[PDB]
């Protein structure tokens, strides 16, 4: 009967990187989605398979909240059926995804004048991710018809890079915080409802 902890998901001080995105299960509470849609902070509030104004009515099972930080011109890749670096190698959404992608500009929270280098994204993978698959395998891979035997062949590549977030940086490169709410629709007794 108490409130679901949306305060501990959205207003958190530290978000994880997109290659190691945080997943929070939400269960055994009541969720008030009307504060999320009516808040003026969220630039992107795109719901697939539900309507944002109707979210106070449906009872759900085990709502997942996926929190991470990407750049501005990659928020379009947090959507079903998109292609990019984030969709292929960092965070994949299923084609039948029923949820809401929420994103707000956090330039004045996640940037430093020397560069906030604590946020990371995977540049390349041997294959695309499955839907909702987290790959934190921080290896060093090889490409170019020489193995990663050493420096004597062609050199090896490191998959994770850091966004060098700056305040001076133009929009589209500024840190955007993304929370992906994923719903599972009424397979069991539902636990999270609306008031």
């Amino acid at each position: 009967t108490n409130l679901c902890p949306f305060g501990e998901v959205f207003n958190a001080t530290r978000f994880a990187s997109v290659y190691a995105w945080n997943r929070k299960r939400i269960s055994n509470c009541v969720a008030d989605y009307s504060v999320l849609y009516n808040s003026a902070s969220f630039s992107t509030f795109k719901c697939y398979g539900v309507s944002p104004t109707k979210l106070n009515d449906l009872c759900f099972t085990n709502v997942y909240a996926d929190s991470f930080v990407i750049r501005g011109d990659e928020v379009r890749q947090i959507a079903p059926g998109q292609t990019g670096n984030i969709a292929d190698y960092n965070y994949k959404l299923p084609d039948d995804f029923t949820g809401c992608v929420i994103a707000w500009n956090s330039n004045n929270l996640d940037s430093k004048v020397g560069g906030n280098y604590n946020y990371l994204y995977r540049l390349f993978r041997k294959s695309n991710l499955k839907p909702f698959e987290r790959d934190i395998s921080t290896e060093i891979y090889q490409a170019g018809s020489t193995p990663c035997n050493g420096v004597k062949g062609f050199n090896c590549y490191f998959p994770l890079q850091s966004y060098g977030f700056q305040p001076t940086y133009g929009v589209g490169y500024q840190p955007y915080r993304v929370v992906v709410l994923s719903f599972e629709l009424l397979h069991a007794p539902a636990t999270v409802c609306g008031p």
């Epitope: 430093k112 560069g115 280098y117 420096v151 050199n155 090896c156 590549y157 490191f158 890079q161």
Partner: nanobody, 116 residues
Framework: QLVESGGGLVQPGGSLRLSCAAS????????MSWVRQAPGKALEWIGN???????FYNPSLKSRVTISRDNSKNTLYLQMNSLRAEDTATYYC????????????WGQGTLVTVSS
Amino acid sequence: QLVESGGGLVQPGGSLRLSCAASDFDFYDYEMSWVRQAPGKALEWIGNIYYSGDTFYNPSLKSRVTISRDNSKNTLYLQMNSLRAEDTATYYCARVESGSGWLDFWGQGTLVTVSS
């Protein structure tokens, strides 16, 4: 001509410092990384230091490895403590490209062996 030092033989109860020097290019805005190659294994990534002294470490080696840099001295410092017998390797300082993950190994590599 860039050189390196600090690599020798060391007991598994202590620590070591490793240094990469830089010459004939600017050691100002590059993203540098420390990797190692064990004998008979692949190259293992130890960590990297970014611009403005921010570090990202291997999760297996988070509590034993510290990486620093000095752009005025044009040097790259690794310090590693509580060493194990498997930690023996050839250690390489590399430069990470931006946008491509290409490691630019211009160091010759330092040989570190541990025993009693």
